Amino acid sequence: HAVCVRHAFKQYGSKKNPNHVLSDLNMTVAKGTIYGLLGASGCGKTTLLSCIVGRRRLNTGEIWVLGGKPGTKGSGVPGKRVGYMPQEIALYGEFSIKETMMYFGWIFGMESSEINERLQFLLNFLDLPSQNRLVKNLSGGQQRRVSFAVALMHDPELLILDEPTVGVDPLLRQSIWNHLVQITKDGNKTVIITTHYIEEARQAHTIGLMRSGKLLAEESPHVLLSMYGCQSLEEVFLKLSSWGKIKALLQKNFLRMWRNVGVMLFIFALPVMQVILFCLAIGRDPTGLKLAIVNHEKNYTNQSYQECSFDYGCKFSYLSCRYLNNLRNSTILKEYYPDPESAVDAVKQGHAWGALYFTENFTDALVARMALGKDADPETLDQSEVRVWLDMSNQQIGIILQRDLQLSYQDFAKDLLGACEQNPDLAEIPISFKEPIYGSNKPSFTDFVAPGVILTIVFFLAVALTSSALIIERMEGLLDRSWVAGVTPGEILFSHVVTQFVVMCGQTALVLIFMILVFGVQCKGDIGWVIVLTILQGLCGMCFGFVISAICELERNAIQLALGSFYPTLLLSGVIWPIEGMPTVLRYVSTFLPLTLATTSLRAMLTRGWSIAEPAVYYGFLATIIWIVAFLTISMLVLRFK
């Protein structure tokens, strides 16, 4: 007895809709006999097969397949001593026919010498095309034959065929049945064909009719028609009463990405281009800001010409074209207007960003204001000033103008004296800013956001790759079919980590190279710890993919969950703005987020040069390691409750 399913109970009930899929089964299959299984549309004939191979655990009862209980330490039924053909196609579209044959042969530990011979024989027998056409390029009716040949490659002693001939030309169905009846001539192998239409399953040695979760007929077809006095079987049925499984599986993972150009460009060429636009468009100070200057001491000749000519040594001549000489030539463009009202009108129409309006007697009232000193009069104070009207609608441009206009005066003051034999330190404010402890006197916004996007690109791209890989391949039956071949769920997960890790050290090597070596983002700290932190953040991201691909079955559902949780963090992690600006009731909450405490640690390791032994640099390692454990605990808990 190859299979005994005596007294098989199985319930899918909910105490509201009790689905008694398997009420009481008494099935027995003898070695060397083809055993058909006819019934309804997968009412109980599609879960009994899964329970035979150990995919689904049985309820109270008995089971005995080949050696003993399925899925035990014998390696009886989940192994190389079985052949499984699923109801649907469970092949890889990006693989050649020969590539698929070798990949499945390596799982069973078959040498490449005999695999080629078996492949050639199978190709000749099943009139398939040459062994160079991809499975995705074959029609839907001839990849079923490829799957059938895959199930027949290793010639096991127990075949579980599920609809082996449904869309097959009967001319090449007579040959299939001849082969099936020939291989079972001796008492070596056995075939279990659970088809759907009765009329073809008549050459089998034994058949079984299944209805309402119970086999109501077991005997041979001839002692069925003779017993029930029937001219056909249809009228009978009218009964109203371990290192080889990781080398050969990593190659598949590294090939399903190379063949898909769209996936390759998304996870390798987007990070490269995104960090190029960011380093070129965000952070740099505005340049080329126009200014409408009114000079009442010179002669108005044109729009972009004033004939600014003063004297240098002493005897201050004009003191208005001299100040404009000290103006910064980088981020200020000067255009001249004839009237104070005309200049203001230009600003109101968006043709400029401000006005200056040096008065008619600025030189006379300025030299007489710094001479008298602290006993001046309101007349000279109100006629020796530059009246600036500014368009302060933009914070970042209203600050550059408000700073370059005052810095240019300090150089002007330090030039007027100093050329008149005086002490330059006299023209200063008592608030003297010494050399900064960290950074430089001219900081950049790019250096503040660059650490914030290193950990964002790496984290998100790991979630997208892991979630899609484990959802598409699970929903297509690739996990279930490969499990029957003996691939325990210990190297399926281990290989994915290795594949994810390798594709991950290549993303870090491109983001860091294109932002530190090129575009010159300062890295004052150790580059050794920067790489480790970036890699560790991603491993937290990959672990998040397991959580996403454990509660969502549909492809579209994981996208909303991934996007609906990422966006909200990243307005709380302080990537684009300092963390200090948030109110101190939500700052505490925002501290326990994934990326918030690692971004701060990476920022302090680049813009300050701190080491690991600093309570702000190692807090970013503990925070990103705890989340790895938390994400690996929720995923296990989810699978337990499902």
Ligand X SMILES: CC/C=C\C/C=C\C/C=C\C/C=C/C/C=C/CCCCOC[C@H](COP(=O)(O)OCCN)OC(=O)CCCCCCCCCCCCCCCCC
Ligand Y SMILES: CCOC(=O)NCCOc1ccc(Oc2ccccc2)cc1
Instruction: Write out the binding residues for ligand X, residues 212-271 only, by CB under 6 A.
Output: 262, 265-266, 269-270
Q: Which stretch binds a copy of itself (CB under 8 A): 73-81, 431-439, 498-506, 623-631?
A: 431-439
User: What radius of gyration do the chain's Cα atoms show?
Assistant: 40
* Contact residues for ligand Y, defined by CB under 6 A: 253, 256-257, 260, 263, 266, 463-465, 467-469, 556, 558-560, 562-563
Regarding 510 and contact with ligand X (CB under 6 A), the answer is no
Among 395, 613, 641, 642, binds a copy of itself (CB under 8 A): 395
What single-letter amino acid sits at 593? L
Cβ proximity to a copy of itself, 445 vs 592, nearer residue: 445
- Cβ pair 624, 543 in contact under 8 A: no
# binding residues, ligand X (CB under 6 A)? 21
Minimum CB–partner distance for residue 44 and ligand Y (Å): 32
| Runs of H (alpha helix) within 476-526 | 478-484, 491-512
Instruction: Write out the binding residues for a copy of itself, residues 42-101 only, by CB under 8 A.
Output: 42-43
Pairing outcome for strands 332-336 and 289-293: parallel
Binding residues for ATP: 12, 41-42, 45-47, 133, 141, 196
Minimum CB–partner distance for residue 261 and ligand X (Å): 6
Q: Which stretch binds a copy of itself (CB under 8 A): 96-104, 181-189, 495-503, 581-589?
A: 581-589
Pairing outcome for strands 64-65 and 22-25: unpaired
Task: Please name which of 545, 554, 553, 556 lies closest in space to residue 462, comparing C-alpha atoms.
Answer: 545
Binding residues: 12, 41-42, 45-47, 133, 141, 162, 196
Choose the contact partner of 553 out of ligand Y, a copy of itself, ligand X, none; CB within 5 to 8 A by kind.
Answer: ligand X
Report the distance separating Cα 59 and Cα 57, nearest Å. Answer: 7
- Cβ pair 423, 417 in contact under 8 A: yes
Choose the contact partner of 437 out of a copy of itself, ligand X, ligand Y, none; CB within 5 to 8 A by kind.
Answer: a copy of itself
What does the DSSP assignment read for 587-630? Answer: HHHHHTSTTHHHHHHHHHHHTT---SSSTTTSHHHHHHHHHHHH
Among 393, 528, 641, 642, binds a copy of itself (CB under 8 A): 393
Regarding 594 and contact with ligand X (CB under 6 A), the answer is yes
Tokens 């391949």 belong to 473
Instruction: Write out the binding residues for ligand X, residues 543-582 only, by CB under 6 A.
Output: 544, 547, 551-554, 557, 560-561, 564-566, 569
Among 432, 613, 640, 641, binds a copy of itself (CB under 8 A): 432
Q: Which stretch binds a copy of itself (CB under 8 A): 64-72, 112-120, 297-305, 559-567?
A: 559-567
Phi-psi category of 486—alpha, beta or left, where left has phi over 0 and alpha has psi -120 to 50?
left
Structure tokens at 182: 């020939």
Task: Please name which of 26, 55, 40, 179 lies closest in space to residue 481, comparing C-alpha atoms.
Answer: 55
Q: Which stretch binds a copy of itself (CB under 8 A): 101-109, 243-251, 303-311, 389-397?
A: 389-397
Measured in degrees and rounded to the nearest 5, phi and psi for residue 440 equal -130, 170
**SS3 label, residue 217:** strand
Task: Please name which of 228, 229, 237 lies closest in space to residue 209, comparing C-alpha atoms.
Answer: 237
Regarding 130 and contact with a copy of itself (CB under 8 A), the answer is no
Among 120, 348, 629, 639, binds a copy of itself (CB under 8 A): 348
Among 23, 59, 174, 303, binds a copy of itself (CB under 8 A): 174
| Runs of H (alpha helix) within 68-192 | 97-107, 112-125, 143-151, 171-183
Cβ proximity to a copy of itself, 82 vs 366, nearer residue: 366
Minimum CB–partner distance for residue 427 and a copy of itself (Å): 9
Cβ proximity to a copy of itself, 18 vs 568, nearer residue: 568
Question: What torsion, rounded to 10 degrees, do the Cα atoms 375, 380, 384, 388 define?
Answer: 100
Choose the contact partner of 425 out of a copy of itself, ligand X, ligand Y, none; CB within 5 to 8 A by kind.
Answer: a copy of itself
Report the distance separating Cα 523 and Cα 111, nearest Å. Answer: 52
- Cβ pair 407, 332 in contact under 8 A: no
